[PDB]
């Protein structure tokens, strides 16, 4: 076929879609020689979600020329929980397709499950949105980021992020009280993956909608770490990196 | 109580009502397990305004069974400017209520302000009016839409909208002269939120009353973007999307 | 100059960078009185790469005080294939440099090639990550390790390593079938360098991403042997030893 994109772990594609599905209905997947880009805005038209999966993330990848797969994510995710986790998953399609074929292959025995999913026609033009320089760049465990966001969103729909020298501060003020989380750059010798990194070019003081942050943290499924890039000028970028790809969320400050 | 619908930002409900109040006197709010729908027609009986706020727009939401709140918007908006902006706001009511309780809670200190607003009895049957397919769908910054409408309404009470391939054209002819605004689909790399999207299934050539467009643009308060859906057959739909909801305006072409 | 670090074989520094360049974009080289440490994480933020080159690896070494050289590896490797292999290579820099000078000297005739490479500003804090004790330590030919990894990665993105008494077992289960490699500690009398050594303090059963293992094996360029240290508690350590240095990869198990 024209496109044959083989994930060795179907669970990888399931975790990708879990990064999207709770805040996006429709997603266009543009498949190219160098891999797959998907983009979608959330129902409120405030959050841009951008996925890039390069050729090397796949066991085998072939796509001579572009193919656009407009998919309903509620449909795709009834079917994406059809792997075994252990299954491989190949996305298969032809030119200007009307359906996408999801081919699950068992990695224990002799079983194939071929699904054909009806595609939808979607606009669709894409934003490659990341700036050349940001005011501050940081990274931390995505489980730590998720907890901070879940915790403070209990208090307020607005979470203020402040970056100062060697200081990252999240703050929310609610009717039952207030929360302030201060994290400092820290390299963990025993478990480096839990480190916190900060590069500050200038201080940042920006407020974000917690309801959007609660969508963003579902990228946790893809990466144990999250990179955050902040700018007084441009939307904030929240990035969950895969092996040969990433899931990006762009979000303007509230003010 | 039977209904307890907690906005974490009272300003959110104020901005919702600001979308309505200048063209609608009376509004029935139907509260359900999945959130709130309000509907009203303007005094001239030409513009239908439809609001839907889902459960997730609220910090906390409970409504076992339907509750209908007929409110005078001039009254509701003397009281809706009683929050601090920083206040939370819970709408509270019981079965077949005669009043609605607006409970504002301070997010800095220990203060509660409980208002009880007398309700009015209103008909009231609701139209879920959006079609399955439209001729053309587009979205743009609501501030850009507002400016175009404010600018051209200075010239004429009729604004013609024409959709052709990759072209959106607004036109007005007045006694002091004429205006033509042409916008083209454009994805902005640095500030995606300012992008213009167009999906044309067939060309459109429709004229609308500028006085109604000037009511519609007050939805600007709720969303930085506006979706517009146009049809030779059905009313035009102008849509301002919230986090877990929307404000919709339906408007027939003038001819 | 402040730093003058002379490799007698430019090919040595080329082989070092080949250990990094396919999984890391940017690398900070910290130069000190006792030699050079470089550290970088891969694009997915899962693999930590740590290089240490001591003074004795160099024909001549001088560096009174720290110097940090942030280098783009794609740039450094267009230039690092500028030696003849037979050339010596001196890295030269001054205090808080903006460029690094690579001075290649011919070991046959009278020729010097001086390159000046623009440096990049990088965070950069470093993890000295190795634990005091691991559950199991082993070493084997790096070409044997590479083959096992290349072979099993054809089958699966997950390679399970199990250590039991006098037994090292690598296993992968794929859609076309499964592979199990069992190696046993063995001292080779004729070619000791090909021996396999195992020290087991407790049994190990850990699964690793094959895509990361495929990055790690490129350390083959530096050493004919690889040491592996495994722990139920800490990341796995894969180590390629030079004369007076090493290249280390730290990698958490998949589960
Ligand atoms: Mg598997
Ligand atoms: Mg607040
Ligand atoms: Mg030589």
Residue numbers in the entry:
A (entry chain A), B (entry chain A), C (entry chain A): 0 to 254
Relevant lines from the article:
PCNA is a ring-shaped homotrimeric protein, with each subunit consisting of two domains connected by a flexible linker called the inter-domain connecting loop (IDCL). CAF-1 association with replicating DNA, and the targeting of newly synthesized histones to sites of DNA replication and repair requires its interaction with proliferating cell nuclear antigen (PCNA), the eukaryotic sliding clamp that acts as a processivity factor for polymerases during DNA synthesis. Recruitment of PCNA-interacting proteins to replication forks is generally mediated by a conserved sequence in these proteins called a PCNA-interacting protein (PIP) motif that interacts with PCNA in a region between the two domains on a single subunit near the IDCL. In this study, we focused on three separation-of-function amino acid substitutions in PCNA that cause defective gene silencing and exhibit reduced CAF-1 association with chromatin in vivo, as well as inhibit binding to CAF-1 in vitro partially or completely (D41A/D42A, R61A/D63A, and L126A/I128A).
The X-ray crystal structure of the L126A/I128A mutant PCNA protein was determined to a resolution of 1.93 Å. The L126A/I128A residues are located within the IDCL of PCNA, which is directly above the canonical PIP-interacting region. Compared to the wild-type structure, there are significant backbone changes in the structure of the L126A/I128A mutant PCNA in the IDCL. The α carbons of residues 123 to 129 have moved from 1.8 to 2.9 Å relative to their positions in the wild-type PCNA structure. Similarly, there are significant backbone changes in the structure of the mutant PCNA protein in loop B, which is more than 15 Å from the substitutions. Finally, there are significant backbone changes in the structure of the mutant PCNA protein in loop D, which is approximately 15 Å from the substitutions. The α carbons of residues 41 to 44 have moved from 1.5 to 2.7 Å relative to their positions in the wild-type PCNA structure. In the structure of the L126A/I128A mutant protein, we observe clear electron density in the vicinity of the IDCL, loop B, and loop D into which we modeled a portion of a PEG molecule and a chloride ion from the crystallization conditions. To our knowledge, binding of small molecule ligands at this site has not previously been observed with PCNA. Of the three mutant proteins crystallized, the L126A/I128A substitutions cause the most dramatic changes to this surface cavity compared to the wild-type protein.
